[PDB]
Design an enzyme around this catalytic site. Sequence first.
Site, mmCIF file in Angstrom:
data_model
loop_
_atom_site.group_PDB
_atom_site.id
_atom_site.type_symbol
_atom_site.label_atom_id
_atom_site.label_comp_id
_atom_site.label_asym_id
_atom_site.label_seq_id
_atom_site.Cartn_x
_atom_site.Cartn_y
_atom_site.Cartn_z
ATOM 1 N N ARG A 248 32.021 58.489 28.438
ATOM 2 C CA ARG A 248 30.629 58.933 28.469
ATOM 3 C C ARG A 248 30.367 60.435 28.352
ATOM 4 O O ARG A 248 29.222 60.850 28.208
ATOM 5 C CB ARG A 248 29.921 58.349 29.689
ATOM 6 N N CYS B 288 32.408 52.520 31.002
ATOM 7 C CA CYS B 288 32.857 53.388 29.931
ATOM 8 C C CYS B 288 33.360 54.743 30.424
ATOM 9 O O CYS B 288 32.595 55.570 30.921
ATOM 10 C CB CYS B 288 31.720 53.614 28.937
ATOM 11 N N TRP C 190 35.551 55.640 19.470
ATOM 12 C CA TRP C 190 36.961 55.718 19.102
ATOM 13 C C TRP C 190 37.809 55.157 20.232
ATOM 14 O O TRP C 190 37.343 54.999 21.359
ATOM 15 C CB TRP C 190 37.401 57.138 18.718
ATOM 16 N N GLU D 16 43.955 50.889 25.539
ATOM 17 C CA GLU D 16 43.215 49.725 25.093
ATOM 18 C C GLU D 16 43.986 48.921 24.028
ATOM 19 O O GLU D 16 43.984 47.685 24.029
ATOM 20 C CB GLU D 16 41.860 50.182 24.575
HETATM 21 C C1 HEM Z 1 33.845 58.055 22.499
HETATM 22 C C2 HEM Z 1 34.693 56.979 22.454
HETATM 23 C C3 HEM Z 1 34.704 56.016 23.451
HETATM 24 C C4 HEM Z 1 35.745 55.689 24.289
HETATM 25 C C5 HEM Z 1 37.098 56.374 24.404
HETATM 26 C C6 HEM Z 1 35.307 54.574 25.070
HETATM 27 C C7 HEM Z 1 36.099 53.820 25.942
HETATM 28 C C8 HEM Z 1 35.767 52.676 26.626
HETATM 29 C C9 HEM Z 1 36.665 51.904 27.391
HETATM 30 C C10 HEM Z 1 38.131 52.215 27.656
HETATM 31 C C11 HEM Z 1 35.954 50.827 27.833
HETATM 32 C C12 HEM Z 1 36.566 49.642 28.576
HETATM 33 C C13 HEM Z 1 37.031 48.547 27.629
HETATM 34 C C14 HEM Z 1 37.898 47.499 28.302
HETATM 35 O O1 HEM Z 1 38.912 47.854 28.951
HETATM 36 O O2 HEM Z 1 37.589 46.300 28.147
HETATM 37 C C15 HEM Z 1 34.615 50.987 27.351
HETATM 38 C C16 HEM Z 1 33.542 50.175 27.654
HETATM 39 C C17 HEM Z 1 32.234 50.322 27.241
HETATM 40 N N1 HEM Z 1 31.800 51.316 26.437
HETATM 41 FE FE1 HEM Z 1 32.842 52.961 25.801
HETATM 42 N N2 HEM Z 1 34.028 54.252 24.750
HETATM 43 C C18 HEM Z 1 33.646 55.096 23.759
HETATM 44 C C19 HEM Z 1 32.396 55.038 23.147
HETATM 45 C C20 HEM Z 1 31.320 54.203 23.431
HETATM 46 C C21 HEM Z 1 29.991 54.258 22.765
HETATM 47 C C22 HEM Z 1 29.659 55.116 21.518
HETATM 48 C C23 HEM Z 1 29.204 53.350 23.441
HETATM 49 C C24 HEM Z 1 27.881 52.981 23.256
HETATM 50 C C25 HEM Z 1 26.951 53.625 22.485
HETATM 51 C C26 HEM Z 1 30.067 52.756 24.440
HETATM 52 C C27 HEM Z 1 29.684 51.709 25.252
HETATM 53 C C28 HEM Z 1 30.489 51.030 26.162
HETATM 54 C C29 HEM Z 1 30.068 49.827 26.842
HETATM 55 C C30 HEM Z 1 28.659 49.233 26.835
HETATM 56 C C31 HEM Z 1 31.162 49.379 27.500
HETATM 57 C C32 HEM Z 1 31.326 48.046 28.212
HETATM 58 C C33 HEM Z 1 32.010 47.083 27.218
HETATM 59 C C34 HEM Z 1 32.574 45.830 27.879
HETATM 60 O O3 HEM Z 1 32.770 45.849 29.114
HETATM 61 O O4 HEM Z 1 32.836 44.829 27.170
HETATM 62 N N3 HEM Z 1 31.334 53.281 24.427
HETATM 63 N N4 HEM Z 1 34.534 52.107 26.599
HETATM 64 O O1 LIG Z 2 39.342 52.402 24.031
HETATM 65 C C1 LIG Z 2 38.219 52.060 23.760
HETATM 66 N N1 LIG Z 2 37.314 52.779 23.026
HETATM 67 C C2 LIG Z 2 36.181 52.043 22.951
HETATM 68 C C3 LIG Z 2 34.831 52.333 22.253
HETATM 69 C C4 LIG Z 2 33.822 51.223 22.413
HETATM 70 CL CL1 LIG Z 2 32.242 51.344 21.692
HETATM 71 C C5 LIG Z 2 34.145 50.055 23.150
HETATM 72 C C6 LIG Z 2 35.404 49.859 23.765
HETATM 73 C C7 LIG Z 2 36.391 50.868 23.643
HETATM 74 O O2 LIG Z 2 37.690 50.894 24.151
#
Ligand code: HEM
Ligand SMILES: O=c1[nH]c2cc(Cl)ccc2o1
Lengths: 400, 401
Positions: A107, A104, A276, A281
């Site tokens: 973070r 992520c 968000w 993505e």
């Molecule tokens: C603030 C907004 C957020 C953005 C911009 C963001 C962005 C991202 C991105 C770009 C990825 C990679 C997705 C991919 O390319 O497949 C990701 C993965 C992840 N994020 Fe964040 N995220 C956000 C919020 C969160 C929140 C609120 C949580 C958890 C409470 C979180 C948990 C995770 C987890 C566990 C992954 C791994 C998901 C996977 O690999 O399938 N994210 N996030």
């Molecule tokens: O671009 C994004 N924002 C994201 C937020 C969560 Cl929780 C997961 C994947 C994401 O990919």
Amino acid sequence: KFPRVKNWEVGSITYDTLSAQAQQDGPCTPRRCLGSLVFPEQLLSQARDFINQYYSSIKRSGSQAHEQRLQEVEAEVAATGTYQLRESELVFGAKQAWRNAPRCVGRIQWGKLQVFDARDCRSAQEMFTYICNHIKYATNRGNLRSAITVFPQRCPGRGDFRIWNSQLVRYAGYRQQDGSVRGDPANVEITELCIQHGWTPGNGRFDVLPLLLQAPDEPPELFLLPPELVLEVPLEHPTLEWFAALGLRWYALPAVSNMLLEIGGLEFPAAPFSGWYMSTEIGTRNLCDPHRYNILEDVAVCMDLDTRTTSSLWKDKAAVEINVAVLHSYQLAKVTIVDHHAATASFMKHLENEQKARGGCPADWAWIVPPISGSLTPVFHQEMVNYFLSPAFRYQPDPW
Amino acid sequence: KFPRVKNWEVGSITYDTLSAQAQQDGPCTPRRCLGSLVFPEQLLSQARDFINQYYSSIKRSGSQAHEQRLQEVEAEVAATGTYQLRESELVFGAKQAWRNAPRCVGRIQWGKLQVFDARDCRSAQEMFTYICNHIKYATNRGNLRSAITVFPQRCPGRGDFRIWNSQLVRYAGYRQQDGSVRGDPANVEITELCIQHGWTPGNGRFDVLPLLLQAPDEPPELFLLPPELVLEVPLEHPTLEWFAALGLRWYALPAVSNMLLEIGGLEFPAAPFSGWYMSTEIGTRNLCDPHRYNILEDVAVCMDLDTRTTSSLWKDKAAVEINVAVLHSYQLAKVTIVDHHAATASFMKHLENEQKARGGCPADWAWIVPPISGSLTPVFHQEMVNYFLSPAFRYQPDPWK
Ligand code: HEM
Ligand SMILES: O=c1[nH]c2cc(Cl)ccc2o1
Ligand code: HEM
Ligand SMILES: O=c1[nH]c2cc(Cl)ccc2o1
Ligand SMILES: [Zn+2]
């Protein structure tokens, strides 16, 4: 002992002293690196550690209240084979699970996560209510707020709560008769399941799929999401007038609902979380991936580009405008969105914050680097260390 | 047992059975992955393994000739502490080294590589003649050809042969008096070293650096590459008429010369090799990296883009156009070059061929995927396994340290 981490752009150097305490073990070995791959005493040991992490976070490590908590959880395990967290602990854990997610890039906002305690959920009907309330609070008319809803934990003597869907909002994918697929090809399996469970399917490319909510020891129930609650954004380009006429769109709220939350040996098979979107993505991955909507060639043809050869970089050109459209559209519709430049730049800040806080930050380079314009972002030139810390969000097998 | 590798685009699946034979350990442990980081009895063992690979390659495994070769190398090592490689072995070895390079997306050409045997070299002056011949052959007036020149191996009783320059052809980096750098900022150290050794520099942005060649236990000697030997390409854009006026250019021949070649336990500290350029390396890395020429902003401003906000993706637009100009310029100048889309597509074929041949292929995902349009290339959606196989090319400390 301590892995030296260098930034080649600036030349700055740091040491990751936090990795030496990685609770779990990764897939890599000194023989070969698999980093690019997508995939009571033991319980008490994990529980003690978490409680210790909590009391250290409120600067009360070693106090009487700390010792009591440790003793109290050790007692519940001896008597029930498991234990229950206190509200403040669940809140704390859920936040750490995000902070520890290596893949992520968002973070930096980990500390402002809003945790909703849904451990009192009685059934699929209540579960649906919780998910709706979550979507309403999170969407917030377009001013998105990060949040998570924690459902009843896995317990011996019954089944677990599970949201069959990979995300709260996903578009259907119908296997067209000729080999093709209308809608999202990644959602073909879940779509066919919704149909098997008595759902009247659609025929569009962007049909919002219903939720398949499963209650402990009970077959999955079907629930339709009220249209007025699922915010969507119509895609258009700032200078390419024809773009809007393509009928492309995408939902505002990204919410993973199939991952398992782990806190101190405890497992929560159902705990949907959301934040968000980062432009790439949607524009690059979801819309341009060959195995997804694959709209790259169609757009390039409409841009009147020489697609007769790779040398012209029509794919690169088309992808850029598609991403411009998503950013422009989301900003026009007053919906929260962040571009890969700002996102990666904020993550670099998160690394600096973490180095002073814990002496390191678990990060998966392959996922942190955006799908387009990699070396144009600051994270590309940043070496990273990948390791598993607990609490954490884990992948789990599909209930079917 | 064997690592399962999957392609997420198509859905295909394979199992890397070759990784089990990895001869040396990497930096990753079950505790944490470090794949993103850039950096007598054993001798006999490595040598025996190599000879086995060579005899197995010519379908003569277990034959009298094979068994005799093994005896020879053992006798030589037991008597001198090292051994002499046969001509055909050096050729086969160098090819495998390229074949085993995890960070090389152009390995589909591993079999077509010209090898120059310079193990008879006795001085820097002679080392220079060898290099010039390499450049001339490899450049081939525009139709580049893969080549490598192997200098005398490392041995007891004397120092090593070295090429202080990181590549045979690179541009000088002059530290201006205001913190700025005129030319390539990545070459400030090597530039200053040439100056300290007697070379009077120029003052341009694209000055070909003199070669700092070193013979065993001797101080490095300066050698200037004849301009007619260095093929360059002037950069222009097919539509952006103002691009040519920027006075930008780049050399045709990419030739790493600071790496060590390892064959059957033997080490060749000086063994320069070359191929041809993949557009992104020049368009994105050399010209757009903030720590290199950093022309991204100037180009965007010339394109009349809105550099006020990042959401406009002005950086992305300028990068794409700079890459187009490199591809356009090289094609016009009749100088070999390949775009990231064709290169990655060819590497996917390499993976298949290797799956049939050795049952796997070491690859560093972070290096294979191009610096731009990553997810648009076939390799981004392909899982990879990274490991060390010998023969191989290895990094080594700078001779001045
Ligand atoms: C603030 C907004 C957020 C953005 C911009 C963001 C962005 C991202 C991105 C770009 C990825 C990679 C997705 C991919 O390319 O497949 C990701 C993965 C992840 N994020 Fe964040 N995220 C956000 C919020 C969160 C929140 C609120 C949580 C958890 C409470 C979180 C948990 C995770 C987890 C566990 C992954 C791994 C998901 C996977 O690999 O399938 N994210 N996030
Ligand atoms: O671009 C994004 N924002 C994201 C937020 C969560 Cl929780 C997961 C994947 C994401 O990919
Ligand atoms: C035929 C044309 C060739 C192309 C297009 C090609 C392309 C590339 C690219 C893009 C890289 C990564 C550079 C970077 O990101 O910094 C690389 C690395 C490498 N290549 Fe290939 N290559 C070619 C030929 C060769 C040849 C002829 C050899 C050896 C005989 C070779 C050996 C290697 C090695 C060892 C590396 C790693 C270099 C390092 O780690 O710095 N390449 N190549
Ligand atoms: O783009 C390229 N081509 C290359 C050829 C060699 Cl030998 C090394 C690096 C390269 O980067
Ligand atoms: Zn690893």
